Amino acid sequence: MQQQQKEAELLQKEEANIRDNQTKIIIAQIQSE
Amino acid sequence: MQQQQKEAELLQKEEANIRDNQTKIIIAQIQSE
Prior knowledge:
part of a larger assembly, 2 chains, mainly alpha, 1 helix, 94% helix, rod-shaped
């Protein structure tokens, strides 16, 4: 369960980075209009 | 209880990142007007 919560942290951090990444390209698209 | 408070930290951090990102795209929309 240490391992489970640790990999939960890992997947949280990678998906947080991903979400920030789509929103970065989204603001780029918004300003490209 | 340690596990519960630690995953509480995790969910607070992910939702805080989501909120900041949402307001980033919101200000992008505001300035796109």
